[PDB]
Amino acid sequence: ADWPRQITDSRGTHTLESQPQRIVSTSVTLTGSLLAIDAPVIASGATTPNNRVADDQGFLRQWSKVAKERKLQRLYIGEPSAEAVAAQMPDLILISATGGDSALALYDQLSTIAPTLIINYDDKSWQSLLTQLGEITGHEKQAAERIAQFDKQLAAAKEQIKLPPQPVTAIVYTAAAHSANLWTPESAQGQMLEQLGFTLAKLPAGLNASQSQGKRHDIIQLGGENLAAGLNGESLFLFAGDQKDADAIYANPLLAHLPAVQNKQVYALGTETFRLDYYSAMQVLDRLKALF
């Protein structure tokens, strides 16, 4: 049997009583890395899930886990519920540092249900994040194998394509859902792109509080008409939205006068590429390889 192990966390000092059989999280990146390192999660963050319900997508440990409770599908930030969590009788629960869903108001509710763990949202790319998962016993060697092959693929891929001289950035702006997020070098998405062969810029620290007048060091979320003169617009990447979405977005009269659009310096990360994780990279890499 396996005994308790000290696991590093965002808090300051967290430990594990025993290898948790059930894991609950809302991180898209974590959900992927979990599958890659063989360790599916009962609940994950996403949008209108359907691929998971699909046939044995390769993981047969999801049919039982989900069927064990209430075939609970993937969740999505903005669906807090103590009763719903309890019904899933989970063992390990991950809570985001900050967001729409309060952590303190759930910490007690979650702690009682099961060991409550505090982890920042998007604070470790598939690189460090994957290594953290490997920390598990009998997972290092296997991890190195997967990482080695993955690293090799990226290596050659990096020496196969080269982006023209100039800084690039990635941001998501959608009115439909009425929300937008700006990526950065610190963000997992920025780090991943950097690995592929892209340069990520750091938004100004002055406009940071241009919109969000609180605390969001983890990520920079803006929207004020201060982004026009903020982001140079040398190469803006978009999430689930191909040249089609960008073709329409160019409607924004205020942001229409964006030089990037005029020079058509806008690109997309793919449509179904809504979810961002270790797997998303492979999909993203394929898009880049086909993009050029």
Name the 3-class secondary structure at 284.
helix
Which tokens in the block code for residue 206? 């002055």
Q: Which fold has domain 1-119?
A: Rossmann fold (3.40.50)
Give the Cα separation of 144 and 46 in Å (integer).
28
What is the residue extent of each domain of the chain? 1-119, 120-292
Give the Cα separation of 271 and 239 in Å (integer).
7
Same fold, 1-119 and 120-292: yes
Chain centre to alpha carbon of residue 215: 20
Is the dihedral angle over the CA atoms 200, 227, 245, 176 positive or is it negative?
Answer: positive
Is the dihedral angle over the CA atoms 23, 27, 28, 32 positive or is it negative?
Answer: negative
Residues 6+ apart with CB under 8 A from 254: 225, 228
Structure-determination approach: NMR
Rounded to 10 degrees, the C-alpha dihedral 121/41/285/216 comes to -10
Name which of 116, 142, 202 is nearest 167 in CA terms.
Answer: 202
DSSP string of 236-268? EEEEE--HHHHHHHTT-HHHHT-HHHHTT-EEE
Is the dihedral angle over the CA atoms 230, 233, 235, 241 positive or is it negative?
Answer: positive
Identity of the residue numbered 186: E
For residue 49, the surrounding DSSP H or E stretch is none
Q: Where are the alpha helices (DSSP H) in 37-139?
A: 61-68, 82-87, 104-113, 126-134
Give the Cα separation of 48 and 180 in Å (integer).
18
Which tokens in the block code for residue 263? 């020079």
Q: Which fold has domain 120-292?
A: Rossmann fold (3.40.50)
CB 116 within 8 A of CB 95: yes
Name which of 161, 180, 151, 159 is nearest 239 in CA terms.
Answer: 180
E strands in the chain: 5-7, 14-16, 23-24, 92-95, 116-118, 169-174, 179-182, 236-240, 266-270
Name which of 166, 170, 171, 202 is nearest 186 in CA terms.
Answer: 202
- Reported residue count of the chain is 292
Which tokens in the block code for residue 266? 């806008």
CB 150 within 8 A of CB 138: no
User: Which DSSP state fits 23?
Assistant: E
Give the Cα separation of 13 and 52 in Å (integer).
34
